[PDB]
Design an enzyme around this catalytic site. Sequence first.
Site, PDB file in Angstrom:
ATOM      1  N   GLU F  48       0.834  -1.190   0.000  1.00  0.00           N
ATOM      2  CA  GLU F  48       0.000   0.000   0.000  1.00  0.00           C
ATOM      3  C   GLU F  48       0.876   1.251   0.000  1.00  0.00           C
ATOM      4  OE1 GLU F  48      -2.037   0.735   3.580  1.00  0.00           O
ATOM      5  OE2 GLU F  48      -3.728   1.803   2.677  1.00  0.00           O
ATOM      6  N   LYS F 121     -10.626   0.114  -1.318  1.00  0.00           N
ATOM      7  CA  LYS F 121     -10.684  -0.149   0.120  1.00  0.00           C
ATOM      8  C   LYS F 121     -12.077   0.085   0.701  1.00  0.00           C
ATOM      9  CE  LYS F 121      -7.328   1.243   2.904  1.00  0.00           C
ATOM     10  NZ  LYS F 121      -6.534   1.870   4.003  1.00  0.00           N
ATOM     11  N   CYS F 154      -4.699  -3.064   3.897  1.00  0.00           N
ATOM     12  CA  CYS F 154      -4.367  -2.637   5.256  1.00  0.00           C
ATOM     13  C   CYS F 154      -5.386  -3.114   6.302  1.00  0.00           C
ATOM     14  CB  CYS F 154      -4.173  -1.112   5.305  1.00  0.00           C
ATOM     15  SG  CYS F 154      -2.988  -0.545   6.561  1.00  0.00           S
TER      16      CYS F 154
END
Lengths: 322, 322, 322, 322, 322, 322
Positions: F48, F121, F154
């Site tokens: 990321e 995300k 993440c």
Amino acid sequence: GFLVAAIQFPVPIVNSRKDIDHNIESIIRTLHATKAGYPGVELIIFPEYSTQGLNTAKWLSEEFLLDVPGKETELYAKACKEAKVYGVFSIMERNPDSNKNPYNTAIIIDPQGEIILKYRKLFPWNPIEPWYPGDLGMPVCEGPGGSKLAVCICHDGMIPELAREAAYKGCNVYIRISGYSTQVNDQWILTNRSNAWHNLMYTVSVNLAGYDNVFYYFGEGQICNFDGTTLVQGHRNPWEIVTGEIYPKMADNARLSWGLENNIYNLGHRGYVAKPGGEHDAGLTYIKDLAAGKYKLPWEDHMKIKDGSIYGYPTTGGRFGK
Amino acid sequence: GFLVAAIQFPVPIVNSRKDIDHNIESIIRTLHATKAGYPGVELIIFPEYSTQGLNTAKWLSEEFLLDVPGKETELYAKACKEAKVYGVFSIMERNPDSNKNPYNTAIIIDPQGEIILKYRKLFPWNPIEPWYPGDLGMPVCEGPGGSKLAVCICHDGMIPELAREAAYKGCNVYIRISGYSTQVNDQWILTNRSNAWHNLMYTVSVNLAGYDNVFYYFGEGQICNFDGTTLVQGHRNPWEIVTGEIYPKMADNARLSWGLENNIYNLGHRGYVAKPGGEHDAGLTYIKDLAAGKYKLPWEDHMKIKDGSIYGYPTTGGRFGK
Amino acid sequence: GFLVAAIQFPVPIVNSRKDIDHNIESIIRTLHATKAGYPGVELIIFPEYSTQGLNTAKWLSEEFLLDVPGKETELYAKACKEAKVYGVFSIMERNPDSNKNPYNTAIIIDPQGEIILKYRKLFPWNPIEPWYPGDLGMPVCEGPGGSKLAVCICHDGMIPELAREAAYKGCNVYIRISGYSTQVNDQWILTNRSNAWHNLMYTVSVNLAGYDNVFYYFGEGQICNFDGTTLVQGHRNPWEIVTGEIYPKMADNARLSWGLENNIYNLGHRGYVAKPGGEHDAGLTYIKDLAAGKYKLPWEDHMKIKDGSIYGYPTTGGRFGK
Amino acid sequence: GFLVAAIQFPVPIVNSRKDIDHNIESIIRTLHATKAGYPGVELIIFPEYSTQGLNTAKWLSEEFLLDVPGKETELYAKACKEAKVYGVFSIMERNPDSNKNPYNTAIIIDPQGEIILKYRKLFPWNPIEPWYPGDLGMPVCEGPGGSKLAVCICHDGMIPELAREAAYKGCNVYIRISGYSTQVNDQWILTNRSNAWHNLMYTVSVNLAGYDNVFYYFGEGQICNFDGTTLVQGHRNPWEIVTGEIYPKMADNARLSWGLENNIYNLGHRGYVAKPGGEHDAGLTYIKDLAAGKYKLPWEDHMKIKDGSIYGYPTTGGRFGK
Amino acid sequence: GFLVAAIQFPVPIVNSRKDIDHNIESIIRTLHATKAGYPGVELIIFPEYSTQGLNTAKWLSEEFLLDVPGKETELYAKACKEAKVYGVFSIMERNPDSNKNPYNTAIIIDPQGEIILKYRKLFPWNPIEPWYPGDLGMPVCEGPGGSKLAVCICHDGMIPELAREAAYKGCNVYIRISGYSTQVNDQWILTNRSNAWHNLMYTVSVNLAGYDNVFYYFGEGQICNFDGTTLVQGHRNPWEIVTGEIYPKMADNARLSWGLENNIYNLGHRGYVAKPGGEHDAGLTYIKDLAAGKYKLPWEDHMKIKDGSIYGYPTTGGRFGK
Amino acid sequence: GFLVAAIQFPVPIVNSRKDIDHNIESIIRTLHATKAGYPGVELIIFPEYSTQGLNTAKWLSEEFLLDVPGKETELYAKACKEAKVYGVFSIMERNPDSNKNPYNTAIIIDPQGEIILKYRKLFPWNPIEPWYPGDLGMPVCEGPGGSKLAVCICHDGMIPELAREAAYKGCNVYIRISGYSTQVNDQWILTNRSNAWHNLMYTVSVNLAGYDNVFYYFGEGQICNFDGTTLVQGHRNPWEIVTGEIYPKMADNARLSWGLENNIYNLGHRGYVAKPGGEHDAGLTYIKDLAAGKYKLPWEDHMKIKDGSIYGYPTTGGRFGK
């Protein structure tokens, strides 16, 4: 960054100058074999006692002592020049002063074949060791990939003041070469880490594989990051080559940029938030005593081991062994 | 031997003198409960900031500062006298000099209720901490079971010279009280070991359980032997009492008897076997510089953090945060 | 089940019969204190050399040798009767044959104060130890909680055949008492596990805390389950009492019920599924040789250490060191 | 020294002789691929069941049994000759005696394509296994780099007497091939270490990756030094090649030179300091009983598992499965 | 805070109602002994199958099934009232619907002797377990020290959605009682941690010591903090009492205060910073499917195990095993 | 199977679009260097923030935002095509809707240079993150060696429901790319394992080496097997390439063949032995609430952190940063 290699070198029993020469040639072949196997390697490190072995019946004899520089160092230099690497070597050095005992010496040779650093063990592993206390301080030199190199020998690594001295002079990759780091193995691992963290520098450390024609699994190789984390820990095998990438500028940048972690700066600038510049007096009596040549521990008048007659050494003075 | 207890004390958020008095009563209750639970305990140790907490918006205000000694230390004194223990306490101390910030202070009180050691944090944790650099050196006092106790505070424990100083003055049990050592946890554990090993002394170290009304699993308790081995490592629980038996005379005996391991002696007596008595000058420039108040790192010119401006602290000196 | 305690006993330097009597009183006090501290304990185990210490300049002298039984064992007997426990003790035993060196002996005394097991170290630790090889085999006795106890001493535990012998005679709890097992520490831990697993029995093992008036962190305490798992591993502290609950009948039941895991049964009954009942002859030449008193390694001719001459011991036999 | 390779071979479900042939060819490709990837490898070791798989519905059928030697071993030999390596293979061997159940067999083939060692599992993993008890003892052969090789199979490695027998005949590199070393994984790791230490020899051990067309993470590879230290432990992946350098002469030299660590010599020469030559009678009843064919455990008349009718095996005699 | 105890209870082989009554008395004695030994304990937890054992030939028979509540639960109720503790118990429960198999049930009884939670195992461990899927959802009750307790049984703990459900209903201490979790041990430890972390709650988990009259070292006891850290991990011993202090309000406070760590809140409020309030629809097809009773894996068509036929169970429904 | 590579990429400080371009070229060189060094690699994964760095003063500006697809993705595609690998890249994506904040995006590009997966995300690391909640669900695509790939970013990896969703759609290799997985490192390691085990799939996960021109030892690389075992865990070095062999069909076969371990099937088919087909209603309120858009935690009306004004974010709506 750069690739470093620590060689867990196995030295056979050494009985003559003839054995010393074979040993030197073995080190040289190993150096070349290492560059061949690791084309990117820029620093190759050999352990304490790797040139002349560990023959405590002969190691004070003239046959067993070398000059630094001398014909043997020239052979190492030639090897470093051909392989285009920095090399670190251990030599028991004949004292130029014939009255005095020899030194335990480490040299760093550059890819041009020049000796760019010469260090003599400052705190000879007493009482067992005959080597004369080193007189060259703790020097630092330019190495590969932005590194500033320094070396210490064996027991020297147990003295945090020596790591501090290296760092104080710019060292960002602190090298330790050892030749008996077993049975006190934990403390060796420990200090390689603390020497790194205390000073925000890398440590690269190696121990001799063995010396007695029997057991060659005493070898160690350890690379620590500037936060004290062990990045690489070799398995213990004879001939093991322990390698890792080092980034000296990252240590430099941490020293420049960090606040809470910047202990090396804090030492001489304590409480700089409350007091501009910090308090420059560290408040430590031993520092002042040591600077004045009067370091004395409160219990010194009650100690046992203070001279080497527990194995056999004249501590009044003179010359012995040759 | 003697039994030591390190208390992983949780402090609530502290908004008032009322809350501070609450912490004081809570600490005293914990002291008595520890003695009741461990009838043999002779030394009970509380963490940094356990008295006043860690309210960084209030911690420099008069309401949040105490005198040492004062009515609050007398309360702690009374508790130690009643329980018949040595106790270690943390107090942010009003500076008698009104033109200077308060100190970060530790005291040891004996089983008679007398303060027998007062230490002002020599190395405030910068740039976050505004405490004035301490001016009482590193004192040592007589403790239980043949101990010579010394206390350092938090960040202090990252400075190997300071552990050396305590040892130099006789310390065989080095106490470290900490408040927010987490995230430097690996390095805290590391230096607790190296401080012990470098100096052949025990270390006993504790960290506050927490401080923010939410998370109280930051506590640490670590007891290290004089060879650097961790003897006891606490589980992380709020209120956890980490205990272990300490044998100060064993450390003393190691210091009197050991040879190769006796690095603390070797530092000031280099090579007594080769040089008559040993050299008392290694040529360490930083020691001479520090002693002279002129320690200066080669890279200070390019450093980013040399005052408290990043936390909005004034940079010109004097008393602030009132 | 029953609760066992292994005592990491520290022995001072022993210079006299006076010091030996002191050790005896210290052991007895420790025995009572252990029973007081652990009211459920039924077996308390002291390390090798805990009675007489390890003074190698004196250990073969009449002053340093005891009879088994004798006035000293009667003192231990009295203690076990009073505390109502089984106790294991180490005694260097005067050889009734004046033309032979003393034995290294272990006894187990029961809660009635009767010596119920006497074992003379079958495998003295050579070349350092001068003890006469034991002549009582590997005995087994009834212990608490359905146990069949056997004791081996130090180096004995490195011989898997001996653990097999104890098992063969019924042992389900194999005790090992040690005096200087450190530096062979990894191998000590290893064999404590393998001795348990190979034979489907518990092992309970202890090492002396120390012996030299300086370092007392050599102590070990290890309890292994019959599957080889370490159930309890002591912290290393002088005076540490390592405890654990043992269930001898569980080992018995494993021996009666297990198939693939039943290596001890399989050794003497090879392949009962393919061969009717199983073959009782694997063709192991060393077993036949050893049984016949002619065990001989192919390389014995070239071995360097086959007597005690390296330690200056006489090589021709008889009683020495008086 | 020499480089060894242990292959965590994954065998697919085997339903016919056609599948067996594909499997053999897979082993051969793997052998060649291993020599290509590791140009210095001299010994390549395949796990138990790797030739014929693990089909317990078919493995006693004539289609599934091979002769040793036979056309399949000749293919392995041809592969070892072309690659110039020593290879170790697992074959379920048709019993030359048609009345008897087949053997579980391991062979070592040299770089000339000669079978230089043939071993038949001595203690068939009962009660689950149909294999007839081996009749070739524990043979030892010359291998690469000064090695003397021996092999055991699966459960055999749990019997320390077998490791002793190998060593007694000169073995300095003891090989174990397994095909179900999970769920009793700890005990496998344990015994590979103890077999090494007990006898001062290297151990090299491998487990089959899997067998069921589903799960292939049962593989293991472990190399232990002659002090019992695990030098290499593979991660568990199918096709994983676990490699390490072995120095047989170092094990030899330890056997020749060592005193305190020389347990294999002590077994037949106990207390040689006090008694010249040592006591040749080990004092062990089970050794004498085993030599005389009368090994009997005290609890044998109370056991449960003693025949294989818990899965389905005729234990009276005869032939079954084909 | 409150103190919790998890009991590594050993169950004998259960052949009769007589044996079941014996287990009940044994559990009650253990409950009282735990309270006596740990006067502060407020929650005592017994493993799955601790009441009735694991006799798979008998476990579906009327003799082996109990009512909840019934005379046996009243006995447990009486014990909890007398000891003034919360207790967790496992009962295989007769299904009031005679056309359905019994349930696998857990109850929590309070210090008043009232059953305050009844849970029927939602996820029977298939294909081995014949229990009817539970129909009481995942209930939560008030426990000691500000806790909201929930219990899952064995295999249930492998389903993260179920831990989420308990949390969703308020649980801050999630209990898992297990009977044969070994061989899934790594995954049991793993999910005990992830169940805690995913949901910001404590987990307290126990496994039966054993069940087969032979091996009783299968026991486990694990307490995890709300950050997923294992606070306490039991040694594996039969009868071991695994204890730890739990602070339910600390978990509550983490749930109220934490941001990035607050995954449980984030699940239902995606991106409140970018989207006003946050999106309440991630587009998770399986959630919508499961909610609708149509969860179907793409590969169900090719699955080998979708009924109990491998264990010889009938596949057509209804009550069996009577 | 196939070889995967996770790149611990170090991103320098990014101050302009010019810096972004250099960064892209660095990623590309790294991709090619990786294929050169690992000729068999089929999937190369970048962390990321690796494209545009982590400049929180500029990352919402138009200069710092890219389109997906766009000229920069075409450069990545060209690289993947030339190297013939699948690549995973992180791009902060300009929102096509100019009213809305940008997305945090991950793409997978195949060896043909086609973007075959685009993920935004779903649960933006709030409150610190400005990224708009993703609207593409959790997509799955065909990868190398029989793999079905999916990616999360993440904090997404902390949500087990997302791993379930991937698996539910066929994913057998679940990829996680992160850019701040230190200080909550344990929980990252934990969830990579649980995401694997819960769903019987491999996980491959990588963290950014660093971002601040100073410290680049935050990198992580972890490959977990479908049983939750960590197969590979990288050392943390900048530029470290963490590699491992993955066998997607083995995960598939476990899903098809396994019973006791088949938790993903059990979720929607609980108690299928007692009830044909299992109970399709999982009995979970939160699942039903989440499907209906009414997920509400019992404590929601008492929470603190619910909007991003603790750093500076307008949470009412609108557009900000550009």
